[PDB]
Every structure is written in C-alpha cells, then in structure tokens.
Amino acid sequence: KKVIIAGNGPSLKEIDYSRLPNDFDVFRCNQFYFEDKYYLGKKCKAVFYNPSLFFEQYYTLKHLIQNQEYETELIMCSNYNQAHLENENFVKTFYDYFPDAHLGYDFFKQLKDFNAYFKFHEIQFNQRITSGVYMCAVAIALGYKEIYLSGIDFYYAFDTKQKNLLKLAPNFKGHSKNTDIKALEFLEKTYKIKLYCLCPNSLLANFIGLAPNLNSNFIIQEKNNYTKDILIPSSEAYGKFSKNI
Ligand SMILES: CC(=O)N[C@@H]1[C@@H](O)[C@@H](F)[C@@](OP(=O)(O)OC[C@H]2O[C@@H](n3ccc(N)nc3=O)[C@H](O)[C@@H]2O)(C(=O)O)O[C@H]1[C@H](O)[C@H](O)CO
C-alpha cells in the first residue's frame, strides 16, 4: 500500500488532487485538526505527536474521536530515546499510560543506518528533522514503499494562533530545509523507496519529483463547529501525570 504523509504547511491547501494515488493510508501530525477542511479525509492510518505535548494531544485526540471529527488506527509518539530530547520516565512508562498508543522509536530504530545518521547530526551539529521526515522513517519501517508528501514547506495551512496551544507552547508567538531534504534523500537512497510531492507550488517540488498525474478526483469535505484548539487536561490530571512531565 502507498502512503500520504502530511505536514501542516500552507502546501496542504494546495494539493494537486489530480495526482492522488489510487489507494493510500494517511499519516497526520501535531495540529492537523486545525485544518478548516478535510484536505485528506477524516480517516488517519496514524497520527504523530511530539513527546512534549503528548499528554495534551492524546487527550485532545480522544475528544476528536468521540466527536466523530477524525478516526485513526495508530497513535504515535515521535521519540528518539535521547535524554536531551524527551523525559525518560514518560518513555519508560508509556505503554501503561497510553495503552493503545505506540512509541515511534519502536519503528524508527528498525532503520539502523538512518537512526545512526540522525543521531550523529543532531547530537553533533544540532541538526533536527521535522515530523514530516520522522513520519517518513516510520512509514518505511512499516514496509511502505511509495510515499507522497504534502504540507512540507520549511516554514501553516490554518490559523495556529489559538489560546490553549499558545499557553502550552508559547513559542507559537533546530530545523532547516536542507537538513530535511538531506534526510529524505538519505532515506530514499538507503531503503529503496519512492518519494513523491503532491504540491507543485511547494518549494518541496524543487527537490522531490511530482507524484504522477492520474485523473483522480477527491472530495474536500468542509468542517464546521470543529475542534481547532488543543484541549488542556484538568490540574488533577496533571497532578497524577506529574512524575512524567
Ligand atoms: C513551536 C514548535 O514547537 N514548533 C514545532 C515545529 O518546529 C516542528 F518541529 C513541528 O512541526 P509542526 O509545526 O507541528 O508542523 C508539522 C510538520 O509540518 C511541516 N511544516 C508545517 C508548517 C510549515 N510552515 N512548514 C512545514 O514543513 C514540518 O514537516 C513540520 O514538522 C514538528 O514536530 O515537526 O512541531 C512543532 C510543535 O512542536 C508542534 O506543533 C507541537 O505539537
């Protein structure tokens, strides 16, 4: 099966739906649910969240599901088993606090050469990949062979400036384009998989070849009265979780 991997950049709103593969799974990340339309449908194979806001995103995801705004088979925390990158207790107890979820590193680490490539450049040169790229590695580890990229623009497809998210991550007021491209090329080259770019106005199309024009239709379903901010747990919830925070 093929996979569409979506970051949340402007390009997400500029998909050339003519080039959509026949049959595919969808990977989403972080604040994908801020999208004002279902640019890639309601059904996710996997949603990926950063360790630092995992508690709050998992809580928000449960409401998205409850409220029939999205579905997802897998729930991934994009960790790396590095003390300077994420809380060691959170990781240690993860499956007991989030039993239907997965540590992304369980899959990421199956790519030995890429794990090594990433670890070296991060710890040595402070080269971090974005989640778009992390999702790619995990996809390859699950045996996907064709990856179609959207929403990756090297710095959203929506107003991210929402009260709760601003409270949790005040930086919504590390990375580079090159670091991401070099990682993608490395993955393509080393693991013999195919990258495609679904967004021809994206700066990404300079680097990855355009997915092929089939004559695909896609219905972009509208959203109303939808969850467009992350939800915050109660202070008693944080109390209980606190060893892991
Ligand atoms: C403030 C802060 O912490 N920003 C980071 C950001 O530097 C980046 F690390 C990332 O990406 P995030 O912004 O959510 O966007 C999701 C992914 O979509 C692609 N994208 C999006 C917008 C854009 N203009 N150009 C892009 O390329 C990138 O592949 C990105 O990783 C991430 O984990 O990769 O996550 C956010 C937050 O940690 C997260 O949103 C909190 O839940």
The domain that contains 214 carries what CATH number? 3.90.1480.10
The question of whether 175 is a catalytic residue gets the answer: yes
**Inter-helix orientation angle 131-141/177-191, to 10°:** 10
Query: Helix or strand or coil: residue 194?
Result: strand
How far apart are the C-alpha atoms of 59 and 237, rounded to whole Å?
10
The closest of 221, 163, 241, 176 to 36, measured between CA atoms, is: 221
Task: Note down the domain range covering 60.
Answer: 1-245
The closest of 8, 7, 3, 52 to 26, measured between CA atoms, is: 3
153 lines ligand 1 (CB under 6 A): yes
How far apart are the C-alpha atoms of 242 and 245, rounded to whole Å?
5
7 lines ligand 1 (CB under 6 A): yes
Segment holding 62, helix H or strand E? helix 54-66
CA 40 to chain CA centroid, Å, is: 13
DSSP-assigned beta bridge partners for residue 146: 194
Header resolution in angstroms = 2.2
**Rounded to the nearest whole angstrom, what is the distance from the C-alpha of residue 215 to the centroid of ligand 1?**
31
Q: Give CA angle at 93 (80, 95), nearest 5°.
A: 85
DSSP-assigned beta bridge partners for residue 102: 76
Q: Give CA angle at 129 (91, 207), nearest 5°.
A: 150
Cα separation values, 65 from 33, 59, 101, 142, 227, Å: 11, 10, 14, 24, 11
Does the annotation flag 131 for ligand binding?
yes
In contact, 70 and 98? CB cutoff 8 Å: no
Number of compact structural domains in the chain:
1
Closest ligand 1 atom, residue 134 Cα: 34
Query: Helix or strand or coil: residue 58?
Result: helix
The closest of 106, 47, 53 to 81, measured between CA atoms, is: 106
Give the Cβ contact number of residue 159 at 10 Å: 10
Closest ligand 1 atom, residue 128 Cα: 9
**Rounded to the nearest whole angstrom, what is the distance from the C-alpha of residue 120 to the centroid of ligand 1?**
22
The structure tokens listed for 86 are 């994420």
How far apart are the C-alpha atoms of 75 and 214, rounded to whole Å?
31
Q: Give CA angle at 10 (8, 14), nearest 5°.
A: 110
**Inter-helix orientation angle 112-125/177-191, to 10°:** 160
E strands of 151-193, at which residues? none
**Rounded to the nearest whole angstrom, what is the distance from the C-alpha of residue 84 to the centroid of ligand 1?**
19
Give the Cβ contact number of residue 58 at 10 Å: 18
Residue with tokens 């202070």: 235
> CB-side exposure of 22: number of CA atoms within 13 Å?
1
In the chain, how long is the greatest CA-to-CA distance? Answer: 53
The structure tokens listed for 226 are 């939808």
Choosing from 63, 84, 121, 175, which is the catalytic residue? 175
What size, in residues, is the chain?
245
Q: Give CA angle at 91 (149, 32), nearest 5°.
A: 30
Expressed in angstroms, the distance from the first to the final Cα of the chain is: 37
CA 212 to chain CA centroid, Å, is: 23
In contact, 48 and 18? CB cutoff 8 Å: no
